[PDB]
Amino acid sequence: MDVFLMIRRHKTTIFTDAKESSTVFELKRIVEGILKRPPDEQRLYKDDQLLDDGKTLGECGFTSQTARPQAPATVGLAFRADDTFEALCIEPFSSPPELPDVMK
Amino acid sequence: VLRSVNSREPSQVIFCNRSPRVVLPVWLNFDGEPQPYPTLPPGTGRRIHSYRGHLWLFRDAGTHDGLLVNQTELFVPSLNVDGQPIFANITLPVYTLKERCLQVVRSLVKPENYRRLDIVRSLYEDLEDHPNVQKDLERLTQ
Amino acid sequence: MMYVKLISSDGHEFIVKREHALTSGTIKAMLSNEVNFREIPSHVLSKVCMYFTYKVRYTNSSTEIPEFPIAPEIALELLMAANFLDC
């Protein structure tokens, strides 16, 4: 079963999919191929929770009926520079304007 | 050109509304005039009596947006084999992003105000040119 | 897999498969590996990327199709973007 995702760090967002049975570590190999940083320099998150390399995305709550194509789930990303990791940080999207009078 | 054949050979059909819309079934009579039939709520079904060679199509009963039936535009009842009815599966199409945006805007703005919206005239025309059964029959002929 | 970068007016960088982006003929012409959109904010361009995923998944499928969802707040802006991108 496919799960659909946005992987997010700072002002970067990646759209991709994976198997419900695939691992956190395997998802990092995907990010490696796109952003050129190996798994050991990556941390992935569900909200504030750190994900274990050997766990499946299913175990970690990404399921085919919550992580949908038209409304994908978010996975957090943090990079290590030198000795220590950065803190997780995800820039929010822009805010829409007021609804025009005619749409109220 | 587009009209039912007066074949006189019965054909039982199940209309299955596998969409989230309220569905309006439309029978094309023998002169080609579109004739509307009772509506189906979303997720509901009806066993109905029709005839071989009769043309049907399906619409959102409120906005007239077009729906598909067994993955296509038109439905024609076939011969029933073994006393088993024909299944007519009614579904959402994959609307373009443009056409879906137009559906939502239409459902939020009264037609009198489409012209007060801050968009190119080209889109004002697109909004007022709302789906219509007659137009689609003129197209489907060509 | 080949990816491309679509960058919004406010600087957000969205990375999607090349195949999914070629849904827009406009994007295809702007490439023929990054593209800058000076008029499309991120709250709109993220929704565009989600439609790509939705279209490629449900085109030519017999599994029942769900409604592609659009909030009232972002509709006018999304219409304008769909018009320009021809999607």
Ligand SMILES: CC(=O)C1(C(=O)N[C@H](C(=O)N2C[C@H](O)C[C@H]2C(=O)NCc2ccc(-c3scnc3C)cc2)C(C)(C)C)CC1
């Ligand atoms: C002996 C006939 O009746 C003949 C015929 O073609 N008749 C037509 C006919 O019976 N039709 C036209 C279509 O084939 C369908 C069929 C009909 O009107 N069936 C009754 C019916 C009533 C309600 C429904 C619906 S649609 C959604 N809900 C319901 C209950 C569907 C079918 C009519 C000219 C009377 C309209 C000449 C064969």
